[PDB]
Structure 1
Amino acid sequence: RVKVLVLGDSGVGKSSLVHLLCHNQVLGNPSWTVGCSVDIRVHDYKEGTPEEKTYYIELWDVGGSVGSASSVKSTRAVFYNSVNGIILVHDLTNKKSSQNLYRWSLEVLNRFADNQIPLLVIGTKLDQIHETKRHEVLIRTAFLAEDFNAEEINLDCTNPRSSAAGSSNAVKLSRFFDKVIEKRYF
């Protein structure tokens, strides 16, 4: 059993990301996610090796807003227990959504050098960043990932090549999930 929280502002592409991570295909008709949605990634630990083993990784998309009232956040807090990894999702076209990752992470880790829970920062809508602005956008997200002591992936969740097997993105994703499993069990 493995529980990975998927955190981020509404509209950044969480449901699309989760769908790609669990089904290797693009989420075609994303609807507004009500409540906590859970999808399972059938994950090959140490993929491609003779010690390959299957784990069911639960991706918990709990939802909500960092601008919610205190009482709303307290009810959300019961979902943040027994967490084995966290994916922090931001929309690369919306600087507000990456800033809000600091609020999201504090909600969990207080209700970063000392944090032992593996973290992964994912920027979505990379396709929407003009080549003109890519250097500036990505320099900032590097600072973001370092603050969390986290690896970073930037991708287009609506392009199935984003996580194609053997791609650089797919390799980093497998490394993160293997680290989640290792810190939980080994």
Structure 2
Amino acid sequence: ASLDRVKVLVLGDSGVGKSSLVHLLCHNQVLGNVGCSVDIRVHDYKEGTPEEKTYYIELWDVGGSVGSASSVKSTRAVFYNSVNGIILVHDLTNKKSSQNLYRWSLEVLNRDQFADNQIPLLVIGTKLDQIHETKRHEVLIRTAFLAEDFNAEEINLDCTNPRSSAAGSSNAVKLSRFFDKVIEKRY
């Protein structure tokens, strides 16, 4: 309903579930089955209040890898222009994808420390249903520091479970508090 544009990047290694998460955040369902793809989340800013306003929040899923040549990272940097928020997606199974988030973030800070950064960040970990009943505690501590070094909210979910995206959820409140913060900081 608003012609105000909001742009949120979705960064992460290939295979962590960026496509399944974006599909979950927009179409409110599960991904059944190249380049940069964009889906739109219709977010009601301050829903139910006297300041309610409908925004169209673009989720930009850029591909690639953090090991490519700087003549390919410089071409990938034109998509990082005019960013209002960044979602960093990592695989709770693949601990190497959580370290590469530190390189994705610097990739955006190199062609746009973390304490001078003003862009709201959100760290989302995937494949939580694949965690063990005794390794749950060990990996959660490794990601709590991940959300502290970025000064970001943390959310851990399974993209194949539709109860991660049910209304009222604690994953839906941290999500709406993030999209609200993205709109507040100069939408």
Check whether TM > 0.5: yes
CA distance in structure 1 between the aligned counterparts of 2:56 and 2:157, rounded to whole angstroms? 24
User: What residue in structure 1 maps to residue 156 of structure 2?
Assistant: 154
- Cα deviation, residue 47, structure 1: 2.2
- Cα deviation, residue 69, structure 1: 1.2
CA distance in structure 1 between the aligned counterparts of 2:48 and 2:123, rounded to whole angstroms? 25
- Cα deviation, residue 48, structure 1: 3.0
Alignment of 1:45-60 (within 5 A): 45-60=45-60
- Cα deviation, residue 50, structure 1: 3.8
Gaps of 5+ in 1: none
- Cα deviation, residue 51, structure 1: 2.5
CA distance in structure 1 between the aligned counterparts of 2:92 and 2:179, rounded to whole angstroms? 23
CA distance in structure 2 between the aligned counterparts of 1:7 and 1:61, rounded to whole angstroms? 7
- Higher helix content, 1 or 2: 1
CA distance in structure 1 between the aligned counterparts of 2:158 and 2:59, rounded to whole angstroms? 19
Q: Deviations over 1:51-85 (max 9, x none)?
A: 32110000000110001111111100111000000
TM-score, normalisation: structure 1? 0.95
Point out 4+ residue stretches in structure 1 off by more than 4 angstroms: none
Identity across aligned pairs (percent)? 100
RMSD: 0.8
- Cα deviation, residue 158, structure 1: 0.6
Secondary structure of the residue aligned to 1:48 is coil
TM-score, normalisation: structure 2? 0.95
Secondary structure of the residue aligned to 1:123 is strand
Q: Deviations over 1:148-183 (max 9, x none)?
A: 000100000110100110000001000000000000
CA distance in structure 2 between the aligned counterparts of 1:9 and 1:184, rounded to whole angstroms? 28
- Cα deviation, residue 26, structure 1: 0.7
User: What residue in structure 1 maps to residue 173 of structure 2?
Assistant: 171
CA distance in structure 2 between the aligned counterparts of 1:26 and 1:48, rounded to whole angstroms? 27
How many residue pairs are counted as aligned between the two chains? 181
CA distance in structure 2 between the aligned counterparts of 1:142 and 1:117, rounded to whole angstroms? 19
User: What residue in structure 2 maps to residue 131 of structure 1?
Assistant: 133
User: What residue in structure 1 maps to residue 143 of structure 2?
Assistant: 141
CA distance in structure 1 between the aligned counterparts of 2:152 and 2:42, rounded to whole angstroms? 23
Q: Deviations over 1:109-153 (max 9, x none)?
A: 112111000000000011111121010110010000000000100
